[PDB]
Amino acid sequence: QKTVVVTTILESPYVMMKKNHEMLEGNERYEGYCVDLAAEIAKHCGFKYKLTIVGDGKYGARDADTKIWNGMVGELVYGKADIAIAPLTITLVREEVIDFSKPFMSLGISIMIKKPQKSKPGVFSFLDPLAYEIWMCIVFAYIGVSVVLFLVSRFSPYNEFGIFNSLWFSLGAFMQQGCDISPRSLSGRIVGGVWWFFTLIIISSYTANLAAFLTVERMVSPIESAEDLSKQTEIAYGTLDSGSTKEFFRRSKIAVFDKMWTYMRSAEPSVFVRTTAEGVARVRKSKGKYAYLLESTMNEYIEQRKPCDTMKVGGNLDSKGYGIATPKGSSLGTPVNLAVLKLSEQGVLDKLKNKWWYDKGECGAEKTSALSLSNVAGVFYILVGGLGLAMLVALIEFCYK
Amino acid sequence: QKTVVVTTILESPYVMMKKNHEMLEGNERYEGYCVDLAAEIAKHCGFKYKLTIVGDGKYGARDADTKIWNGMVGELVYGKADIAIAPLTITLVREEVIDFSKPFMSLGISIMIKKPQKSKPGVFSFLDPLAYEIWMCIVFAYIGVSVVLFLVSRFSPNEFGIFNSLWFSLGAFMQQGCDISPRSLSGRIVGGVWWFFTLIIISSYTANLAAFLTVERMVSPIESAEDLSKQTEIAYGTLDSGSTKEFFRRSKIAVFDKMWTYMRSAEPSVFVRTTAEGVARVRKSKGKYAYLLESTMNEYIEQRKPCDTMKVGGNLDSKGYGIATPKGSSLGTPVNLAVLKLSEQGVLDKLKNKWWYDKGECGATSALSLSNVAGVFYILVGGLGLAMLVALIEFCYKSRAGRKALTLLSSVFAVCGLGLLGIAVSTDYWLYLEEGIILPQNQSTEVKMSLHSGLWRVCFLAGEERGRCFTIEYVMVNVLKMIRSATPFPLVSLFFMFIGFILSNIGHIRPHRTILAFVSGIFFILSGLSLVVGLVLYISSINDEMLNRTKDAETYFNYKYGWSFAFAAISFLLTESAGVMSVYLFMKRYTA
Amino acid sequence: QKTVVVTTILESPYVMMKKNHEMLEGNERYEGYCVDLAAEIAKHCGFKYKLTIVGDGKYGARDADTKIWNGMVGELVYGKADIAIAPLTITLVREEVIDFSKPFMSLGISIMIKKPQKSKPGVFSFLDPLAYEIWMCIVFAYIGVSVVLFLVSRFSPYNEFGIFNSLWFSLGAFMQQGCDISPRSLSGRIVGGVWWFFTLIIISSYTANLAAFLTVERMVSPIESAEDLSKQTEIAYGTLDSGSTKEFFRRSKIAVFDKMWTYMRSAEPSVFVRTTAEGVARVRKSKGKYAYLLESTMNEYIEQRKPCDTMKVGGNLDSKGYGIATPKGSSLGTPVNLAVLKLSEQGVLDKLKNKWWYDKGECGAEKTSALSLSNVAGVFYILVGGLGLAMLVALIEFCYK
Amino acid sequence: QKTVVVTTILESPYVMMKKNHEMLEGNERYEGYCVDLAAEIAKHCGFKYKLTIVGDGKYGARDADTKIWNGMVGELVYGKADIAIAPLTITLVREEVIDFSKPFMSLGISIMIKKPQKSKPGVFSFLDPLAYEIWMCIVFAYIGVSVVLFLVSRFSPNEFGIFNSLWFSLGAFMQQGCDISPRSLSGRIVGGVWWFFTLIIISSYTANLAAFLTVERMVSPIESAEDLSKQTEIAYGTLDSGSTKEFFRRSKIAVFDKMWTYMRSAEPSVFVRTTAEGVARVRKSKGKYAYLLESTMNEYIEQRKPCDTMKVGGNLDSKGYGIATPKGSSLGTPVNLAVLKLSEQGVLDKLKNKWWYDKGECGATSALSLSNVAGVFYILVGGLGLAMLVALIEFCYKSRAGRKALTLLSSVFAVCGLGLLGIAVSTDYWLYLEEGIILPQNQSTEVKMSLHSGLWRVCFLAGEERGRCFTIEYVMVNVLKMIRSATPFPLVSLFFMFIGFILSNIGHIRPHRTILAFVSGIFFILSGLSLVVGLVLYISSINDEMLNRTKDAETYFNYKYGWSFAFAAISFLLTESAGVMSVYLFMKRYTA
Ligand code: NA
Ligand code: NA
């Protein structure tokens, strides 16, 4: 009848070279999202098509001097193609020269951080089953029950409870140990037994909350939005050195993306990578201190690669669309536009996206280990620090003995 | 030229009537997203426009018989409108008759759930790993061990009084073992079993609290449609007429086919008929309902007071709102170039932040908190306050300063002790018990059956309000036969108490010998320990049959104790006190 | 062309009367498995059918005196029907007079027990975090460390450790309490500290295993097979008073079903119910002490009703089949036989069974409570029994003082 | 009449050749289910038969081009056979060309998994809630607290020796607090922090053991295809050619469509090509592979030695094996009546129990077991045996029976102590570390990189076997910079030890004054406590970077310590012993 020269670009999962492409020939050399999409457009619009990768290898832009269009846009304007079933972003400068359909895929700028791991434990990590409000109120109560036991014994007599001895009865009461002497007045018996019931609940609450932490691994991200990235300075963030994503933050005006751009423009060292593969490798080799601002479709795809190291957080920052382009004044413009809206409402576009991102995507969708010395290392430090601060006070003691 | 007739629909925050709607006139009667969007398009395309609200109040659909469009799509096809700057979904059946621009807003089907919003701990929530019958019977065990300590020691070859025996049982309970040790083998049996008792109780407290804190960390909130698909404790529903309901019936996606399966067969009806109804059902369900709606409404209602609902997960499909034109218009091409310019100049994100978020009525650690354990501080502050109270009266006792009041308190506690157990075992109020069904609206209860209970006499109440006091000897369950096993121990308790009373009386009538006072002291203690065996049997019989109920989500039981149960608890404290009083003056007869 | 009079019986989920059957009329009065099956047979074999419930209301049997066939078999033999798309069991006596197809549903005799619940706690239920082998070895070791501490102190002297005192040091060491006096020889210091490390592990093992039990509810059934039912006598089991299931155990000869029949024949009271609804209600109102031996298709269906009270355990005891019956010498015999094998291999028969048993089936496919007094009641009993056995030995003591 | 030609296939346990196959001849060459079934059918139908094995060795299928059946279905259509008494599946394409009887065996697709078979606890598995570096550093903390107890007390205004100081730290560690109390405020700081130390350690032991026992109760075995569908840690596969593989590709059932999705895209290939291969992959995977096969093979292989695999769940579909006839035979109707008679007389269940189970090579509590805690009994029996050992030498010491050997042991421990730490910090064996990949077959390892390590000198090894001893000052990670932070504390430990040594020497050269012996005693204890800060920093630096690894299922790390790490541990025990020795003879100089 006539052959239709379609044009796409080499980009996963849209068009990939199949494993046996040196022995296959025709439209069977290539596989991917746009290969399956071109098959669906052809069966609805009724044409025979020839898959053809763009020679220039770009998407399409107009030179500011020669006014000549590069990429897949250039093959439609000048005549080398009949349709571009490809991830072309529907933009203002391209709609003036070629005709887009409705967006078969909606996307935007997203955040790629490294997938969060357990943590490194600090020194006072052993205190974390109880909040700092609790630990300070225990110290306040330990001074509290010792001052009262001093006033219970010295005033209203029955002795052997000084300000140093009342701290020493209540201390072994806390860690459930044995003391030298017991109170013998009923006022002192209340100070004993009620503080005994206090530390019984606190030790049990410490052990039970630590058992919940060691059983259920509940990892969180520091970043859940670009509002979170703007407020912080610990995690660095950047875009690619040339493209629509860096140009988005350059001319943005809202509240946050201006704040994010003044960060990225100023920051030393350079947050701007030069390749997408450089920005993904910089996320993995930064131990969770670099976030790469890129498109949501690549962000969901790289998250389904190996290793399982990157993560998409938050929502999109803008709203773009990928359209199927035809030359202006073409006989394919209207039926392909009606074909995209038919495939969208039937679930075909959702089905092909679940296939090439999740079904054909690796890393789809324990056995508690021993506690390392890192988790309880601060308890050794207070212990030896307690042994060091006891040899000093004994040396302070024989300065006046 | 002429004025372009802009047809829109009344929908918030797209087109809203202003507050001064009656006084102010023209195109200035209206505010919203699409009113600001119509000004941006007319500025770039270069026309003067008039805003009109569609008469039908619909978006647009063709009749299956009449084939006439009824809405904003109808006014474009039939010539009444020149443009529809409106939240109009770009649809296959609509694109055949009108021309859409590129989407000015990308959107889809989302999930609306109620925020968990918290679980608030009370004052004595630290007691919650054990039931209140355990904490009651621990105190009965604490008094019971101490008086047996006093009995076994100061009659034997003292250091142990009841002041020291209450002190040994404290340090053993909170695992201190502070210092005092029973020396005879008979005293060591008391210390032995009370050491094993508190070893189980502290282990049961820690392990049940570890169970509670672990299960609430297993609670995963809904973050996808797969989460709604699996979890069936949250019911989810759609509006009864619209594109969101029609999405699930035709979907050939595995998770979405299962969700329509759940919704088409669910009792009662999960399909609301109004968006305001579906938002209301989210709020009056305490996180047990999830409403599937449009994402732009889900983001807008989340920013309205009350700040109660939230948007979870992503979108379930991808569709867009477009600017629509008569399909033969000379305006459709500059409008299409206008929307793509406003998308790239950030005007559309600026206007969405304005109406959804800037005019939003809302805003925008895993450790144990201090509110979880604030009550054990309150006992501790309360303990130090009570200790300063005794410090006055003990300093007063030494500064200011026999068997007579000791004789008197032994009798008068045994008088009230024999009386309170007697009127408790006779009267029938030992167990309240309600039954019924949970009505869906407001969880309003209806008691299908109340009860009264004694030991050999139950009586029914308001639910079937009959005065028919059924004897347990013959009528008509098994839990009334389980308390028959519990029944003899308060009877033996009253029997040991009476013999201890009459020997306490003739010890006061005839104080000639001494030994009959100690025989009284044995009998009050054995009567109290028989009450502990009785009350633990009585409560354990109830909790076993509360478990054997075939638990349902439409039944409820509200078992309760009464003043007949309470006077038996008072009967314990008085006879164990009169047991301390009886061994006291028996030592005075040896002394004097 | 001609109308086909099909015959079925009123039985869920096979043919049920639809909710609006008084206003609907035709083949739309009825719904169910066999209603959807008759629609699938008609679209493959090409006929128009009339749904007709059997007047007699039975499945079909031959009278031993009149030799006349009842039920749906009788309407095919004498002429009142053209096909019986129904759950008819393919048997020897029916195949001689009518023609069955291949089995569209395979089934057998199964076991219906009540769905297991938590338990009722006994008296020594508090001991259950540790096995009885552990508890006896602790008592052996407590006597062991007390006899050794006696020989450590009396032989090889340094006293205050008799046979009663050495039991008393090791006792408070077990429950982590304070004792009156400590050992003062290095041999006694080893007996102290090593038994101290013993009870530290045992108390921690008790608390941790109890925390695992209270967190993960893992309920089990006493019965997992008919081999389990034969060996026990606690749970009673029976069949219906008349039918194929009772006749199966009557003439069985293998090993176990003869043992099960001698049980059921002898047992008092009667294990044989007279209705299926009586046997299901007897399972629910027996608190897990009655098992009802019935067909696997009703057992899976009643399990998906309300309440969620019954459970199917084990596998099938025999192997039966439900076939679609035609009269002998019929023009529908061969195409319906080829229709059943076509619907089986396409998944239609599996799809209709998932619909009417699981998708149209209710009861498809936490928040830890406080411990009741029932769980720890035996600890109170040993305590008061310890208080009772101490007042007695003190009374034994003053018989020789 | 003629002899009926029975065509069967060689398949166990349906038709098997006997052991005496060479000598015995006729129809008696064969045994099995279908040999017994052919005898039962010929007895009821009344014919004499001859058993033949099919030449092709196939069941039967038509070619897509040639349209010729190749198997037992082929010998029936083409006249070579009169009946096929065989495990022949009743199929739609087969029923068109031959006549099947009713199914003599009902069957389907099942799941074959490996039995868990146990997890066996070792001797010292009770130590496993804490790492062995914790249990090592507890003993270092136990020695460290005791020697500081002795230092702080017997130099001050004794009850405390090192014999009593090791005893106070025992009762505090196992939470007894048996009886002795430090009286001065300086001694109470030692008792204070060691009470808080063991409060965290016992709580960490109990909570981690509660985590372990809870997670292993969360382990649910596979009991359905829905369990295989959800859980992706067990890989499941089919045979590469057969009806079971063709079942999943055409299935429109939601759980079965997802299983084919997992199997069509999985690396490496889950599809085996032989049934014997698929059973083998179940056995060499330790419960990480599940083979989807025929139910009758799954029940038969389960009864074969080794008793290693099991059948879980129910069947995934419903099909049957039938007796097949030429479609124009006068034998098909009595055979159909024969199979229904043998089904009801229990003959078919008798023959299945015979070959599957009666000739089967196999057979056919939730509490903590005594094997989990047997090691703490072994310490306890070991403790009582060690206590009787000291009972001899303490009875010997009293029966038989100064500063000189006390002077000698103080020196010679400080000589070896200064030497062992010196040669440890200099040499580079502090950390072995292996890296590599896990080969699939036999889990055979290959070390891609070994390491040596010191404090300022690492050296590579066999994986890229280079002798290039990289200095840490400049080369080329961060964990080598983390041990740089650890580095000064063994250097200060050696610095405190040398000053303590030379003051110990001139105290022996010049015993004129006394005070320089105690200054020696301070320096050995502070050197040992600096080693505790050093070794805890050194180990915690390693375990933090072991966590930051981006954990994969194809990588493995096998970090290990060496004799350079071990001599620093020995350097602790000797200087803390020489610290006890130094304060001992300083008290002898006061005494004498
Ligand atoms: Na203690
Ligand atoms: Na837990």
Author numbering:
A (entry chain B), C (entry chain D): 392 to 549, 569 to 775, 782 to 817
B (entry chain C), D (entry chain A): 392 to 548, 569 to 775, 784 to 820, 833 to 907, 919 to 1034
The article reads:
Synaptic complexes of α-amino-3-hydroxy-5-methyl-4-isoxazolepropionic acid (AMPA) receptors (AMPARs) with auxiliary subunits mediate most excitatory neurotransmission and can be targeted to treat neuropsychiatric and neurological disorders, including epilepsy. Here we present cryogenic-electron microscopy structures of rat GluA2 AMPAR complexes with inhibitory mouse γ5 and potentiating human cornichon-2 (CNIH2) auxiliary subunits. The core of each complex is a Y-shaped tetrameric AMPAR with a three-layer domain organization. Auxiliary subunits are membrane proteins that associate with and regulate AMPAR trafficking, cellular localization, gating kinetics and pharmacology.
To gain insight into the structural mechanism of PMP inhibition in the presence of γ5 and CNIH2, we supplemented the purified protein with 100 µM ZK and 100 µM PMP and subjected it to cryo-EM. Data processing revealed two populations of particles. The first group produced a 3D reconstruction with density for two γ5 subunits per AMPAR tetramer and yielded a GluA2–γ5ZK-PMP structure, grossly similar to the GluA2–γ5ZK structure published previously. Because of the much higher resolution of GluA2–γ5ZK-PMP compared to GluA2PMP, the positions and orientations of PMP molecules in the GluA2–γ5ZK-PMP binding pockets were determined unambiguously. The pockets are mainly hydrophobic, mostly enclosed within individual GluA2 protomers and contributed by residues P512, S516, F517, D519, P520, Y616, N619, L620, F623 and L624 of one subunit and S615 of the neighboring subunit. Consistent with the critical role of S516, F517, P520, S615 and F623 in PMP binding, alanine substitutions of these residues caused a substantial weakening of the PMP inhibitory potency. The resulting GluA2–γ5–CNIH2ZK-SPD-PMP structure is similar to GluA2–γ5ZK-PMP, except that the latter lacks two CNIH2 subunits and SPD. Crosslinking of C589 cysteines was not observed in the GluA2–γ5ZK-PMP structure or in the absence of PMP (GluA2–γ5–CNIH2ZK-SPD), indicating that CNIH2 and PMP together are the two factors that cause strong deviation of the AMPAR inner pore from the fourfold rotational symmetry, likely due to increased protein flexibility in this region. We identified four PMP binding sites in the ion channel extracellular collar, a hub for regulation of iGluR gating. Given the substantial remodeling of the extracellular collar sites upon channel opening due to kinking of the pore-lining M3 helices, PMP acts as a wedge that binds to these sites in the closed state and prevents channel opening.
